[PDB]
Amino acid sequence: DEATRRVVSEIPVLKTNAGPRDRELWVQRLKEEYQSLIRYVENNKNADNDWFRLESNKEGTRWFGKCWYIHDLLKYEFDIEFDIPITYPTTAPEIAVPELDGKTAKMYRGGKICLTDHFKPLWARNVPKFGLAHLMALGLGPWLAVEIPDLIQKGVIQHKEKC
């Protein structure tokens, strides 16, 4: 409940229960996604914690972006990607960070991140309120906060940009 509502309630809930096959309903959903993502990124910029950017193909089926992690004044950047499943928004998309594939146990084949036990049940009971913003906020962000410090310490991540 601490790692729940605390971080949800700043993100506006989504409404449309539609997936990438639902034609006119999907577009409505897609618009809600963009609105929620814009709102989240704004709140991030204001809290000085602008940690990710995302974008999609025209159909909104394929997402790609970058996230950022600051550790001891070093800034790290990682490419992210995911497809929207046909049964979305019932089924949560699977975020991949491909350049970290091989380096961490909390990952499946292809760089797909492995989430906390919270996530899958918590998503499942809120359908279709949670969207891509919630996926970032409760999925990728908590994951980065555990795994990136770990990989840094182990000396296995290549810092690419001077900060």
């Binding site: 897609l30 963009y34 814009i38 995302l54 999609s56």
Partner: peptide, 14 residues
């Protein structure tokens, strides 16, 4: 309000 194209631009140019 705004079209999908508008929203994509807004997200991008931010």
């Amino acid at each position: 309000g705004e079209s999908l194209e508008d929203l994509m631009a807004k997200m991008k140019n931010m």
